[PDB]
């Protein structure tokens, strides 16, 4: 058995392993999410598609349950482990209490795992950041965000990855109860919020929307293509 | 970089960790032992640091079994650990085989235990050496001495401590093979008072013990009348 302290304190009370994990998550592809009136949407950037892949196998937007979905930035191999553990937890909760989970319940579970890997012997921390969205039985949309340290908040709209430093300033100024009225209004909002960070031009973006019905619907390339023309 | 572990030979084939655990003993106060026809006699110069302590604290003579004594030198905590191990070894032997353990067997068992701590990086060698002593109608008196490395030899008189050099030199002029315990006890008192330094250390305590035929093979502490007389004789001899 391997029992060593990998992440330990430092002069001035820093955790260098966690700081390095965050410096790593600061290099992924940008993700953006907003919370609508009756819809929730996410959006991820594709650095390059390479003209030879199969996009069905490199998707960064999964579905943990009927009403919960997520999108990450960082390291895909770690993201996969976290996602599968969250799926098993959702099934256990359904089995024991006879009701689908809340968004905050699964956010707490994920953050607890991430924190546990910062204080155990013989482990390094996870190198991913997640954005979790969904609806509940009340009919209230939610949007959260976790960190490699185990801390999570609730936000109106947020952006993770590289270029988030400008996506956040853009979204701060432009977010208002007017761009929220309708789905084809919020979706164009998200698209123009992502486009000024995509310096390639055009659509190198994946965009998934989730409404109270027809869950985790994913916009087709042609459909997403139409919106870009409308903006211009 | 070879001074930090008991798993590293020096380029010349030495183990400096054991060599240092030996210095730990090579600067501690002296204890002697003397073998006789009838029995054995232990003697230790017990140091009294300040007035505050009660006399009787930090004893260096233990009772490992009803016929085995023991005198120690070095780190007293390690010494007490070893004394518990030895008590454990003797009791198990009696419960397995139905009679008392021979001193030769006990010393062999404890030396193996001590040597097991000289091979690994996860532990450190003990920092105390000690002497044993018994008396049995079968083999008569006996005396052994174990080192921090785990070597155990038989002796006629041993002088573990800091004044080993001066202690051994004076004990060799004794003719112990013919004396008796009553005639040896006085000699132990005298030689300890001679080897004792009265400058660095100002005050010291003296305690004695013996195991022989006069105690019917049971280890004891020398009674108070014998001790007072011994001290007086030593003082008279010293001038």
């Amino acid at each position: 058995s391997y029992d060593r302290a990998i992440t330990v304190f430092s002069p001035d009370g820093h955790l260098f392993q966690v700081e390095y994990a965050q410096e790593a998550v600061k290099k992924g592809s940008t993700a953006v999410g907003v919370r609508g009136r009756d819809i929730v949407v996410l959006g991820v950037e594709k650095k390059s598609v390479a003209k030879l892949q199969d996009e069905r196998t490199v998707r960064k937007i999964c579905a943990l349950d009927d009403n919960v979905c997520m999108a990450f930035a960082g390291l895909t191999a770690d993201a996969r482990i976290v996602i599968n553990r969250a799926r098993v937890e959702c099934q256990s909760h359904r089995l024991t209490v006879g009701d689908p989970v809340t968004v905050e319940y699964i956010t707490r579970y994920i953050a607890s795992l991430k924190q546990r890997y910062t204080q155990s012997n013989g482990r390094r921390p996870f190198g991913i950041s997640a954005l979790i969205v969904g609806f509940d039985f009340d009919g209230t949309p939610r949007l959260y965000q976790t960190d490699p340290s185990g801390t999570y908040h609730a936000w109106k709209a947020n952006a993770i990855g590289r270029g988030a430093k400008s996506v956040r300033e853009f979204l701060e100024k432009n977010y208002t109860d007017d761009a929220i009225e309708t789905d084809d209004l919020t979706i164009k909002l998200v698209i123009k919020a992502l486009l000024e960070v995509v310096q390639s031009g055009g659509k190198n973006i994946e965009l998934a929307v989730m409404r109270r019905d027809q869950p985790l619907k994913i916009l087709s390339p042609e459909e997403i293509e139409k919106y870009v023309a409308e903006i211009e | 970089g070879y001074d930090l572990s008991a798993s590293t030979f020096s380029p010349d084939g030495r183990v400096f960790q054991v060599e240092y655990a030996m210095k730990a003993v090579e600067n501690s106060s002296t204890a002697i032992g003397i073998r006789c026809k009838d029995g054995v006699v232990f003697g230790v110069e017990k140091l009294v640091l300040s007035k505050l302590y009660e006399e009787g604290s930090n004893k260096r003579l233990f009772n490992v079994d009803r016929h085995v004594g023991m005198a120690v030198a070095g780190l007293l905590a390690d010494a007490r650990s070893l004394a518990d191990i030895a008590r454990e070894e003797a009791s198990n032997f009696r419960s397995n085989f139905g009679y008392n353990i021979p001193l030769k067997h006990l010393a062999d068992r404890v030396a193996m235990y001590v040597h097991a701590y000289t091979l690994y990086s996860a532990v450190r060698p003990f920092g105390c050496s000690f002497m044993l002593g018994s008396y049995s109608v079968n083999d008569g008196a006996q005396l052994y001495m174990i080192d921090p490395s785990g070597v155990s030899y038989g002796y006629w008189g041993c002088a573990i401590g800091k004044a080993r050099q001066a202690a051994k030199t004076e004990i060799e002029k004794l003719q112990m093979k013919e004396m008796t315990c009553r005639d040896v006890v006085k000699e132990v008192a005298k030689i300890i008072y001679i080897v004792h330094d009265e400058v660095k250390d100002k005050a010291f305590e003296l305690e004695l013990s013996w195991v022989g035929e006069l105690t019917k093979g049971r280890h004891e502490i020398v009674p108070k009348d014998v001790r007072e007389e011994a001290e007086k004789y030593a003082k008279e001899s010293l001038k």
Binding site: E23, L52, Q53, A77, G127 | S5
Partner: protein, 247 residues
């Protein structure tokens, strides 16, 4: 003890993983391997690295390793780790078949292996495997497929990939000669031969410096068949002829 520890599973001051970065450069210098997907099946085509005259060709192949009745792979990097990985893949496929009484899908196989590759980078103190893999297969849901893993533990589906040595230029020339949907198995073989002919520093191929396998469906059955020296020689002759004729 702490003095002798090498700390294989820690982050770098910039968020990197140095042991994985070094295993990737190890895999950089291995023998060239390449795969190509088509309408009626997939194909692998590796390069023979040990060409000594005094060797023996007892095995039906050198870098193929049929994993199941429907799949097969190929490796680049360290043979000793490759053997461990291949044994593990076979065991995973048989456990699936025992539980469900149906063959396993290719994506599930690749996933179950990449989990093991990832668990070697997060805890344990060991070093990671220095091996990259390519897979080919056929299942009920998606038909002919072609994947690829790497030491870190992330995979991805492709249509024409390449690992090993000079894989950069291999993929560069693959991008300009592959047309989605219209490629048949014969045009696939032609392109594979003509890519291998260049991305190898030698003057020209030898039909024994290469190793070629295919995969097809015939009469409701999968057939995995390693091509023969005469067939390869004929293909090389065909390549020699047409190329010569153009100029």
């Amino acid at each position: 003890s702490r003095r002798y520890d090498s700390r294989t599973t820690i982050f770098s001051p910039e968020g990197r993983l140095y042991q994985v970065e070094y295993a990737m450069e190890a895999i950089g210098h291995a023998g060239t391997c390449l795969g190509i997907l088509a309408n009626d099946g997939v194909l692998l085509a590796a390069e023979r690295r040990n060409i000594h005259k005094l060797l023996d060709e007892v095995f039906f192949s050198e870098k193929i390793y049929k994993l199941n009745e429907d799949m097969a792979c190929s490796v680049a990097g360290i043979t000793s780790d490759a053997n461990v990985l291949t044994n593990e893949l076979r065991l995973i496929a048989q456990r699936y078949l025992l539980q469900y009484q149906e063959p396993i899908p290719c994506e599930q196989l690749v996933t179950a292996l990449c989990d093991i590759k990832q668990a070697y980078t997060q805890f344990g103190g060991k070093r990671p495997f220095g091996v990259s893999l390519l897979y080919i297969g056929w299942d009920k849901h998606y038909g002919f497929q072609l994947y690829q893993s790497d030491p870190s533990g992330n995979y991805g589906g492709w249509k024409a990939t390449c690992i090993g040595n000079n894989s950069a230029a291999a993929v560069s020339m693959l991008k300009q000669d592959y047309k989605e949907g219209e490629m048949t198995l014969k045009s696939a073989l032609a392109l594979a031969v003509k890519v291998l002919n260049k991305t190898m520093d030698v003057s020209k191929l030898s039909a024994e410096k290469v190793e070629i396998a295919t995969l097809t469906r015939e009469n409701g059955k999968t057939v995995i068949r390693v091509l023969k020296q005469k067939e390869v020689e004929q293909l090389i002759k065909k390549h020699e002829e047409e190329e010569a004729k153009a100029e």
